[PDB]
Amino acid sequence: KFYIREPPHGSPDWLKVGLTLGTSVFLWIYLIKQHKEDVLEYKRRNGLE
Amino acid sequence: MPLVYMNIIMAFAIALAGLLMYRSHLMSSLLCLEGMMLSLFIMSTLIILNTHFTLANMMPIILLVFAACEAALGLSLLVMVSNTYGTDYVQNLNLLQC
Amino acid sequence: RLQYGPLAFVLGERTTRKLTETSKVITVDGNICSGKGRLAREIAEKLGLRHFPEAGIHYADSTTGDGKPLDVQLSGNCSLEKFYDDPKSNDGNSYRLQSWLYASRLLQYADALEHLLSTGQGVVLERSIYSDFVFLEAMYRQGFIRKQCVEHYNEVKKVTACEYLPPHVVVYVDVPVPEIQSRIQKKGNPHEMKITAAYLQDIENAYKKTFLPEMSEKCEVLQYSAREAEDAEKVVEDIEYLKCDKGPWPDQDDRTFHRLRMLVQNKLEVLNYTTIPVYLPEITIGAHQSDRVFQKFTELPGRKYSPGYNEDVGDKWIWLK
Amino acid sequence: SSLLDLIWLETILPKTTSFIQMKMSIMVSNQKGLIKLYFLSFLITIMISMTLFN
Amino acid sequence: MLKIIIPTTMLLPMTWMSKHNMIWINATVHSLLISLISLSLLNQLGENSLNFSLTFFSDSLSAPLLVLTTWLLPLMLMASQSHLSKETTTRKKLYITMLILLQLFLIMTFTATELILFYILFEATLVPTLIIITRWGNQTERLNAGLYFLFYTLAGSLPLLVALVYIQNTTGSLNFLIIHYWSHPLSNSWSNIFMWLACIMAFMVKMPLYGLHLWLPKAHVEAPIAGSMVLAAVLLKLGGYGMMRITTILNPLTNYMAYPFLMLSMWGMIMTSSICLRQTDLKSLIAYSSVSHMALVIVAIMIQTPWSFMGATALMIAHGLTSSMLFCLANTNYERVHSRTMILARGLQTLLPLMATWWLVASLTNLALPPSINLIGELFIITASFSWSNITIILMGMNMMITALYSLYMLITTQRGKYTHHINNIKPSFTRENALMALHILPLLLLTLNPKMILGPLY
Amino acid sequence: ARQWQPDVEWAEQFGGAVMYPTKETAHWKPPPWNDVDPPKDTLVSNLTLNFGPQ
Amino acid sequence: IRLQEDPDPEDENLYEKNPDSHGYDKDPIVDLWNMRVVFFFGFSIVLVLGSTFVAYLPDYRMQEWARREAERLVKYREANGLPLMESNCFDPNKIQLPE
Amino acid sequence: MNPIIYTTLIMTVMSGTMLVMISSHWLLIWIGFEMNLLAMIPVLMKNFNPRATEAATKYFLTQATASMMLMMAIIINLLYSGQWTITKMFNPVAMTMMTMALAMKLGLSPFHFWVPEVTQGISLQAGLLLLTWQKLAPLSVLCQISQSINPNLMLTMAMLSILIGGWGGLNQTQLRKIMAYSSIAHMGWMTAVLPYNTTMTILNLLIYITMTLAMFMLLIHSSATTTLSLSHTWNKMPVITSLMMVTLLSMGGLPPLSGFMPKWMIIQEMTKNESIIMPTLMAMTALLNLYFYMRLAYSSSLTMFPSTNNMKMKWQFEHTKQMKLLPTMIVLSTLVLPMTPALSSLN
Ligand SMILES: CCCCCCCCCCCCCCCCCC(=O)OC[C@H](COP(=O)(O)OCCN)OC(=O)CCCCCCCCCCCCCCCCC
Ligand SMILES: Nc1ncnc2c1ncn2[C@@H]1O[C@H](COP(=O)(O)OP(=O)(O)O)[C@@H](O)[C@H]1O
């Protein structure tokens, strides 16, 4: 212990850390799925594949 | 247009010129502001009654409602200014400059 | 919630509900080298209140980082011993010390109010910002400071102390000047032994003629001599049997208490007007000296980053914090 | 160096323009903050916009 | 061009992530490597330009300017590390960051293929320069100097922006290749006159043109050594490059509209040389020499013949190198005595021999001494102006005489004579300073050996 | 031997009510630090009434 | 005085602490290695290698190509009695003048 | 003021603006204006002092007059067409009344004085909300009625706005007055491009809102309301001054910063319609705005002004409240020039 008073950010807010990581992962997987669906729909509509 | 609309528009213009030309009191300016909405009410109801726009007859009432909302706002600001300075003179509202 | 603010207020945390009617602010005052410190200790321990020793230099050091004080060059840039030795210095040390002490007293008062409002426990300060001006008048009437210094002090005191609730109880310990000098000689500290008699008389005149008449109108004022101050039991009994309803504390509500607690929990807004661009030669510091001292302060061990993010003092999980 | 560089080439382009802008800024920003005055100005502007803009 | 653009954008994180004592070493080493890589752009074609992509292209006019910029960065680093010893690590890194940003903007400016992208970049070069001047300058006048520099350049360049968007709306494209192939004659009308004026005046202020030049002494005197080096070596060449680029679409109106600018340039060349004759400040003397040489380049571009364009390019490169060297030498003297007055320190030849040699070589190149590229460019410009008219030779001869006079006067005042008695803090020259002067001077002589590399596309 | 930095003269140049003062603007004063002007000593002037004798 | 300002520091001399100083850095090792890298890279690599690279750059300007083409054209034209320099750049048959 | 009352008043201001921006009826548009003003007055008067009271009084007087003129224009338009839908107005006199009323609401010259006066009177949060939101609503109305705007009147008011903003900002020293005159100039630019491309008007509005939010939040963070108060920030948090410097450079329109994009696109669009004199004058007059931005930047970041002695205690303490979206606003206001072709998405 160094600080006379406990710092507000003494230990990581694990709830916030988990929410942040989960939100990032969810957004990334959603973006990947959305891109795949967009490519498939574009190819189907243009009659390419 | 008949002369009646001319008279109502002239009255509105007179009330508008009254508001833009302060003399000493803020209360007189508020009275001029209330007269403008009276002229607007009269003009709108004259127009609506003449063309038999039946559903528009509720418009002048909403006009009156927001008229007196503005009058309430002005009276509140006037009492705060009077509490601060002792009089409702517009000359005392000079702390802020352009 | 999890931190006081508008969300906590709309949730329903109310200062009046928190208080227990025994939450009082008591400030002990007296001339130099009196028994006010021991009397404050006794009152705080008997009433169960939290004691706040007189805020000298390095109080801000004690309340931040580690409790250990910092170098004088980095905390205050002023010396009480040097003030005693050469009161009429040519580097403005007297008024630098006075302004720094006023800022420290303001910070301590904010801390005391924050503790009282967040806990409901009363506080006993060994001096307040409402008694600090007596030393300014003593300095001015002895020629130690200038009229410009007095005016700057008055401006800062106005715009800062106008926003805080006055103490509930003001306990003044009246000790005659010759007794003050005798006690100073007995203590044996050379620096305060250099104190002249005219300086001590000016503080007493300021207390008697300005501070006590000014605080008598607000709330209760109790005055004791040396003998009466020695018996703290009667003082605590007198405090416990005070009837008063003419203070601003009864007039306070939950909204005003919320505003006050928001003000006092933010220490930078407390000190906001202590650094106003009034360029007195006493307090103004040049660009180069300011840059050098600020670089040194950042080079201090636990001062480069925020408290939770200093790796050299043993803070882990920084990458996830 | 003196007559042209330090005096007249300074006076023609950068000094005269700066002086004009400073004077215009003083004129614009030197207002007493009176609602009577600038509301009379509003009235004049309304009249001018009504008459001169058709 | 990405093989040169990306390494600079990697100089940025490397500078910010390197240790506190390795910043100068890393920046210098990798700047030199980037310069070596950029040397490969000198291999140009005889028919057309090097079209890398839709965005960047290189020509015989762009390539030497890019090489000069990339070679100039490490020299600025050396001078900066001379005068910024006591700065904090963050401020040193910010200084290097401003230099790196300036180099990146200059590279993209010279390689831009559209006039609008060229405008955006060559206006973006102002921000790092202004920050450098007004932040790390020494004296009080740095603030006024920054204001003058900024507002002169912007007042010049805004009508250029309006004219460029107008030309794009009119013709369909601002691409340099398209506007060269689809160029049409400009009729003699007031609208065309004012379009010509907008473009030319922007670049003339950037040159600078005589009468529009006060910002140059103000900024060059009051900027730090790196700022002075980049301002004279490269930033004055943006105006010449722009004029050599935009005048494709301004014909035949240039034949009639060039008279005021030619007269201004010639007479102001004479006037600024004469001003140099009677200057009490060394930096001001160097700045006015820069004004004279750029006036000569303006004359070349305005007369606009194939022999003048080669002279313009050669003189631009030579002046960049020579002015950078002169500023470095003056800065070393200033670091000795903490003053810019020319007559304060004397006898520096008997106190510092090798620096006297460097002063002699730099002053010899400052005047047109054959076979230096300075003389090559000046001689080509003089010949083209003679074919233009036969009194331009009179004006050019007067200018050459006065140029020799003031260059040798500066050398004699600073170096020869007897040393000032009370100046006893003149320590021996540093290896860093000597290496800086060598790196300024040796490439100039190598260019003299191979002169076809800096004569432009018209060669 | 060190870079020039602004002093109290420069700061006082920048610390007026407005830049480029004139007579009226010099008669003006900078606003208070916390924007709270000191209250004016307005007189309440309570109504005085004779309640009686008639 | 109007400020609490530091006195102007004395000029710091690199030769006092380090007699064999190159003027790059205060630390002797950093200063020596800065000198070594600057000299090596700049002089050796950039100067020598860039100069020889520029000297032996391939003839992409087609100077020698143009000289050989001109030699061939001169030989052919003076062998057949044609003028060495053609009178027109383009073909007047393919050019159509206005009436 | 109670937090619940403050948040419901803010919700009412936003509801009034949204009613203005979604209504297809002139009466409902006027109702939205009235609701916005009524809920906006206490927000100005939140921190009670005579300056705030005077600023709120002047704001109320100006906005009430503008609303009266706007309702008169609506009634006159109804008289000659019998239509309530917000479209091209069918009477030139009604259109001129509407244009002047909306200009008075926006603060366009010569209806500008109230903007610096009110901004100086009210606090930093109140000024931020005022500038941003109260520019947001009338501009939407103008965009809806754009096709009947008198180009001569609109461009005259816009050019007057640019000139007046430049000169006032040149003279001022108070940060809130500087921000007010900056707002006047930017409104001038927007309304100048208004009769040609409402898309360019919206783009300028968005970039101006981003830059103003960043600047006002930096001022709130540093707690500086004057130039000299801002001159001490380098000794407590030097990063804030650097961010403020780059934001000020962006607001002056220097490339490649985000503030160059609106000026560039507006000049291009105006030149497409054979306007050259107006774009050249508008571009040249912005140099005054850049001058007083640069003068403000010299004091804060590029030079070190003298500090005081209690700044040491301020060093010892740390900033508590966290500004929301300040880094995002600072990035968006300086580094979005390469993303320019998104204005087609904005179309
Ligand atoms: C449409 C939504 C817009 C934004 C709404 C939210 C605004 C308030 C929240 C951000 C406040 C400022 C950022 C700093 C926060 C510091 C406090 C902290 O530790 O925050 C942690 C937080 C992650 O916590 P968590 O609750 O998990 O967040 C995701 C939601 N579950 O970490 C963060 O919050 C940091 C990352 C925030 C998200 C990126 C920044 C906003 C911009 C998103 C992209 C859009 C860009 C253009 C914006 C304008 C046009 C729409
Ligand atoms: N405003 C002030 N100016 C100068 N000195 C002060 C000020 N406030 C307190 N001091 C010094 O701090 C010390 C406070 O302790 P004191 O009042 O003597 O109680 P104790 O006898 O318990 O030490 C005194 O020596 C006094 O001189």
Side-chain angles (χ1 to χ4, degrees), chain C residues 9 60-61 64 73-76 96 100 107 255 266 271-272 274-275 277 283-285 287 294 303 306, chain H residues 1-4 223 228 232 234-236 304 306-320:
Chain C
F9 186 81
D61 315 7
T64 60
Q73 186 185 192
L74 307 173
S75 288
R96 269 206 311 276
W100 185 266
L107 183 74
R255 45 175 297 271
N266 183 17
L271 307 167
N272 185 24
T274 50
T275 62
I283 59 183
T284 305
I285 303 190
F294 182 73
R303 301 293 189 165
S306 295
Chain H
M1 176 179 300
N2 201 78
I4 306 184
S223 290
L228 287 196
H232 291 181
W234 71 276
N235 214 19
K236 202 267 175 291
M304 302 181 166
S307 191
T308 53
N309 203 76
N310 319 271
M311 197 59 64
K312 308 191 167 58
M313 203 174 309
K314 277 183 178 177
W315 301 341
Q316 300 191 20
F317 284 98
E318 188 77 16
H319 205 258
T320 64

Side-chain angles (χ1 to χ4, degrees), chain A residues 16 19-20 23, chain H residues 322 325 328:
Chain A
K16 280 186 174 179
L19 289 183
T20 311
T23 307
Chain H
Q322 298 187 189
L325 306 173
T328 309

Side-chain angles (χ1 to χ4, degrees), chain H residues 6-28:
Chain H
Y6 184 70
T7 184
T8 199
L9 291 181
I10 297 294
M11 290 291 299
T12 311
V13 164
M14 297 189 166
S15 304
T17 297
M18 290 307 301
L19 186 61
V20 168
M21 290 203 302
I22 74 175
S23 296
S24 69
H25 199 283
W26 273 120
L27 182 64
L28 276 305

Side-chain angles (χ1 to χ4, degrees), chain B residues 1 70 93 95 97-98, chain H residues 34 54 68 80 117 177 181:
Chain B
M1 297 174 53
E70 275 189 2
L93 310 172
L95 299 184
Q97 286 125 357
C98 177
Chain H
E34 294 291 335
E54 168 176 353
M68 294 316 102
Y80 278 84
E117 292 176 8
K177 311 189 70 174
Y181 280 107

Side-chain angles (χ1 to χ4, degrees), chain G residues 47-57:
Chain G
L47 283 193
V48 177
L49 297 192
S51 66
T52 180
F53 180 78
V54 168
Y56 293 110
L57 275 182

